[PDB]
Each structure stands twice: as C-alpha cells, then as structure tokens.
C-alpha cells in the first residue's frame, strides 16, 4: 500500500534516493513526501535496508549531531552551569555539525561525515 | 597561611603561573603542588582572580571539553542508544578536545575557548 516507488517493511514505507544532495536538502526532500531521513530502530530494519541498497553507494541516515554548545566540565567535577559563566561576547566557538551515512566496506555499516557533502539518501514514511 | 608564593581568598590559596605550558602540563604542574587549575564557582572569586592577573596575559582555567563521543540524535527524536548501533569499526570520529582561558579585551575580563596544546600561563587553586 506504499506509493509505487517505495518498498514496504513492517508498517513503514522506504524510498531509496538516486540523487546526491546535502543532509539538510535530503531531509527536506524526504519531508515534502511526508517522510524523514531513515531512523534505524531495530536490527531487522537495518537488515531490510541493506537488502535494498547498492554496494557501490553511500546514503545519508536520519542521524546527526547539530553541534552548538560544547559539554564543558570543571576539572574537579564541580557541575558546569552555563548561566553563571563569564565568556567573552560571542564565545565560546560553536561545535560544528556532523552527519551519518550508511555504506559498504569490502561489510555494511555507518560512518560520520560533513553534512554539506552530496550523498544519496534513504527516506522512511510511517504507514 | 598559604605558602609564600600563593595568595589567599576565603578558604582557598591561589597561584598565578609565570610559565607557559599546555593545559595538561599546567594541570600537572598544579597537581604536584596539591592544587588544580582554577575552578571559578562564584562572582566574587572571578573578581578576586582578575585583581591578581596582568592585563597583557592569558591564563588556562580548569575548564575544558575532553571531546570523545558526539551527542548523536535521530531526526524524529527517537532516543539514540549507542549500544544498538552499526558503526563501522573505528567509527565515528572522536570529537577533538577544547580548553578555556581567561584574558583581557579592550572594552574587559572574560573567558575564551582555545586548543588545549597551546602554551598559556595558568592559575592554580589549592584547598586549605
């Protein structure tokens, strides 16, 4: 009961992109189709996904680190409280974003990557 | 009642280094003296510290990010659980460390983040 270009597993529909776009644009592409970049909840889901991928291809997952604030720690384990700090204006530097891909090494598994690189992607639509 | 080269404030002793070393070596230097790189708990402590620093100098604080694992998130807010992942061996990349300094800018005193291996002066705090 999934749209034609989609494949069903359990009560979800999956779309394997053919285009290469950044993580943000890939998520947008999933979004307008009523989907998200793929969230892998179970081992069975990972196995189904890899049976629908091409070994010569790399795909964005719906897994990322948005970056932003670092998890600062005092050296004596005094709790760090952001609200009582004395950072100079515009400090400290924001942590950069990072994104995850699934691909095949000669097997299948995840790797981290810059979010702005063009990769293929996997969308999941809840059915 | 602090050792001679140290200054007292409340029930703590403070040492202002003259030497420039990495964060790790600065912490080690504090450690062998029975101290830590300075942890700033209160506003009065920050004010006392800045009254004992030189405006042309930058000093490591006992504040850092050890790096390591990133705080990964699923796009639909499913909790990320590291124990049920499929990362390739040696993946993902560790986040790099970062360290904090106190120094003076024209218009005044405040903290900045910095690479941990840069030589800076340092402040030690000893519990009395």
UniProtKB/Swiss-Prot annotation, chain B:
It is found in: Cell membrane. A carbohydrate binds at residues 58, 97, 103-105, 112-113, 120. Residues 2-128 are extracellular. Ca(2+) binds at residues 91, 93, 97, 112-113. Residues 9-125 form the C-type lectin domain. Glycans are attached at residues 29, 56, 83. It is a single-pass type II membrane protein. GO terms for biological process: adaptive immune response; antifungal innate immune response. GO terms for molecular function: carbohydrate binding; metal ion binding; pattern recognition receptor activity. Lectin-type cell surface receptor which may play a role in antigen capturing by dendritic cells. Specifically recognizes non-sialylated galactose-terminated biantennary glycans containing the trisaccharide epitope Gal(beta1-3/4)GlcNAc(beta1-2)Man. Binds to serum IgG. Efficiently targets ligand into antigen-processing and peptide-loading compartments for presentation to T-cells. May mediate potent inhibition of induction of IFN-alpha/beta expression in plasmacytoid dendritic cells. May act as a signaling receptor that activates protein-tyrosine kinases and mobilizes intracellular calcium. This is C-type lectin domain family 4 member C. The gene is CLEC4C. The chain holds residues 83 to 210 of 213 of the full protein.
